[PDB]
Design a protein around this ligand. Sequence first.
Ligand SMILES: NC(=O)c1ccc[n+]([C@@H]2O[C@H](COP(=O)([O-])OP(=O)([O-])OC[C@H]3O[C@@H](n4cnc5c(N)[nH+]cnc54)[C@H](O)[C@@H]3O)[C@@H](O)[C@H]2O)c1
Ligand SMILES: NC(=O)c1ccc[n+]([C@@H]2O[C@H](COP(=O)([O-])OP(=O)([O-])OC[C@H]3O[C@@H](n4cnc5c(N)[nH+]cnc54)[C@H](O)[C@@H]3O)[C@@H](O)[C@H]2O)c1
Ligand SMILES: OCc1c(F)c(F)c(F)c(F)c1F
Ligand SMILES: OCc1c(F)c(F)c(F)c(F)c1F
Ligand SMILES: [Zn+2]
Ligand SMILES: [Zn+2]
Ligand SMILES: [Zn+2]
Ligand SMILES: [Zn+2]
Lengths: 374, 374
Amino acid sequence: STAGKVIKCKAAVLWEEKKPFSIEEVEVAPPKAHEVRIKMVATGICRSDDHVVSGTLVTPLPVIAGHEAAGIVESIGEGVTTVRPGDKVIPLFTPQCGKCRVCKHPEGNFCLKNDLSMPRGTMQDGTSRFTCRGKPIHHFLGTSTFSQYTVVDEISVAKIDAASPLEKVCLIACGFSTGYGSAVKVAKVTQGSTCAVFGLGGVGLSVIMGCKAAGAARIIGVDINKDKFAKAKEVGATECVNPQDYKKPIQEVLTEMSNGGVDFSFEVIGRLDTMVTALSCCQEAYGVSVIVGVPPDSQNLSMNPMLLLSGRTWKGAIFGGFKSKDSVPKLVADFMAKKFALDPLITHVLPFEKINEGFDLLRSGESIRTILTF
Amino acid sequence: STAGKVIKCKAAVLWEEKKPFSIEEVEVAPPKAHEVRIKMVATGICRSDDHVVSGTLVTPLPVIAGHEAAGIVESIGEGVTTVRPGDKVIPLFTPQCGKCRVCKHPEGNFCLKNDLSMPRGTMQDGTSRFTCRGKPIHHFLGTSTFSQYTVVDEISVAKIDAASPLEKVCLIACGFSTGYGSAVKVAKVTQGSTCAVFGLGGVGLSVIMGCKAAGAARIIGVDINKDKFAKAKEVGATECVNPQDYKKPIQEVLTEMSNGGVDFSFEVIGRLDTMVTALSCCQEAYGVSVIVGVPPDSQNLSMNPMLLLSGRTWKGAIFGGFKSKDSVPKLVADFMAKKFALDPLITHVLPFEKINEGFDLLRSGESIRTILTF
Ligand SMILES: NC(=O)c1ccc[n+]([C@@H]2O[C@H](COP(=O)([O-])OP(=O)([O-])OC[C@H]3O[C@@H](n4cnc5c(N)[nH+]cnc54)[C@H](O)[C@@H]3O)[C@@H](O)[C@H]2O)c1
Ligand SMILES: NC(=O)c1ccc[n+]([C@@H]2O[C@H](COP(=O)([O-])OP(=O)([O-])OC[C@H]3O[C@@H](n4cnc5c(N)[nH+]cnc54)[C@H](O)[C@@H]3O)[C@@H](O)[C@H]2O)c1
Ligand SMILES: OCc1c(F)c(F)c(F)c(F)c1F
Ligand SMILES: OCc1c(F)c(F)c(F)c(F)c1F
Ligand SMILES: [Zn+2]
Ligand SMILES: [Zn+2]
Ligand SMILES: [Zn+2]
Ligand SMILES: [Zn+2]
């Protein structure tokens, strides 16, 4: 039995920026009241985890990163009602407390209990459950999935189908749901529309999936890496364009291709310049542009507000707009019912011990999602 | 008797930026095919007209400005089907051609025949109907209402009720419709919501009227001129704040006052800084901010896209999102039926000949709308 005891297990600890993960032994405290300790089964490598390594995203170090995962409940703290030992679960990097003004709002999902805006790198109670070589180690987004065991607050965990294949459904924890929801829920892509998707990684491919599911007639993929185009077409892109092939700025190309601007555009990269390009390429009177990519820390963009005065809508979202604890089980159920596919996103499956090799595949351009198996 | 003849009449010609208008004789050509010549009855002074004088808004000079007006058809050119001589009409500064992709779209209003995006200062055919001192004079937004007679393209005029009081309904040509539609159509303000309105001139008072019509529970008016607060409360503001009274930036003050951000904010001034402040003060996960104010020519704002990534929606609109030719007659019908009030916006009345005094009143901060009578 491990319940009520400290677990010594393996984890990938990030001690400082721009260094490899250190795979080593950590101690994982048992869960306190309203907390859940989870044996991890599979975790994806999302670009947002690479942002913590690169310093694009600031969060307290040292840290156990990782936020796109699934596993099995090992134990529950006092007062937990929503999961039990042995349940398949997904940690939620955006919590759903159910009590805050956002949780109560029909269109809100960015729960005020989140650890994104102003990251503390702790549990809800402001403490850490992790130590390594006698030092406290920070949590990441209330999840910390690069560990054989994690501890999460109840509001940051969802119970899923006992028959779920966790090596696939872990992508519902971030990249699939974010892209799909950005198209179907945040943009509300319409039947017959023309869409432009900037960035053809795991999240951008999931935006294409959503645009196709919503009945878009044209879906133009934009990436500087033409190796990304074949899989973008497989999942629904009708055309792909590489900005580097053109003398004109790509906003002009896309406005020309779409006979005066697209209905919906998506920025799924994380660059200030492409956020402005994507806004510009949507039709000036009724276009909608959605920012999905995470910008670099503390940098402002420059834009001409006449782009909005003509009638454009500009919005962004975390996690595809989905209220996390309500949505994740339904998405897993939809997957089980063959409503969408996840295999197109998975290009590599590695043991957890090869986390660094997984990140090198992402940085080199080769991979979409690497799944790590514990 | 004047049909098919040049008309000599008085107009207010702007020869140079930052100068008074010159009230002097012009020659107004008869209408060509699908053109309408109109005897003006009343015109409002909108801050956008002043922007032409200040250079905030760049359009070719010399010019006959004015865009907020009503008048009576003097004659129609060949092929005109939608108005006749003796009809009461409102010139439409945003046309409705009914044929372009925007006119066809259910939510579009910024018709591609507009002269706002890249002003030429002409009729649709690229020529002028105005001569002064033997020199061609520019049109403005295809309206040019600061003249006893003007000529407009058919797609830039709407027939209105024959019993209309033109000295009131001229405000449906810009300021009222813009502010009211920005609330009810563009933002879609909800019952019980909290709104913040930056700028309490004629357009921002119209935004308040729309927010109140839509059922908002709290409407916070924001102006640096506290003399504007009594009228804002009369038309529905629940409280007014002057940024100059506070040590902290007003986005922080409004976030505190609204227990975490407002539902809907409106920038109704034309400043880059207040456009950012207005976005920031709406709730970060589900807030909506609407740009109404006209920015200074060719200047970019700076903002942090994290404001959007959390869930905010940012949009702008021309003319309250109204399809102009469909909507203007209906708005006049609704005014006739007492569905909204215009008198709260009218603070001064002058003869056309006292146009310069009317602009002095706006610049001093004393007026909301001055109505000039021909
Ligand atoms: N909003 C959310 O909740 C959320 C969720 C998940 C991911 N993200 C962010 O979404 C972005 C994409 O994540 P991902 O799909 O895992 O990353 P990824 O797999 O690195 O994909 C990014 C793609 O952008 C391409 N690219 C890079 N520069 C350009 C350019 N200048 N023009 C066009 N294409 C370019 C690049 O070749 C790559 O295929 C990252 O910034 C993530 O941090 C946000
Ligand atoms: N989008 C459209 O279709 C449309 C239509 C009509 C007017 N406009 C624009 O809307 C704006 C307002 O027009 P209006 O109501 O006729 O003008 P106005 O009467 O000049 O009202 C502007 C108000 O803003 C106030 N103000 C100025 N600076 C600040 C500040 N820093 N903070 C708070 N309040 C401030 C000022 O005291 C005044 O009461 C102008 O920029 C117009 O050009 C746009
Ligand atoms: O990929 C999801 C994701 C985000 F969208 C962020 F905005 C963020 F800060 C982060 F850490 C993260 F993991
Ligand atoms: O007041 C309406 C109005 C606008 F909203 C503009 F954007 C513009 F350029 C202009 F000239 C105008 F008159
Ligand atoms: Zn919450
Ligand atoms: Zn992610
Ligand atoms: Zn049109
Ligand atoms: Zn105006």
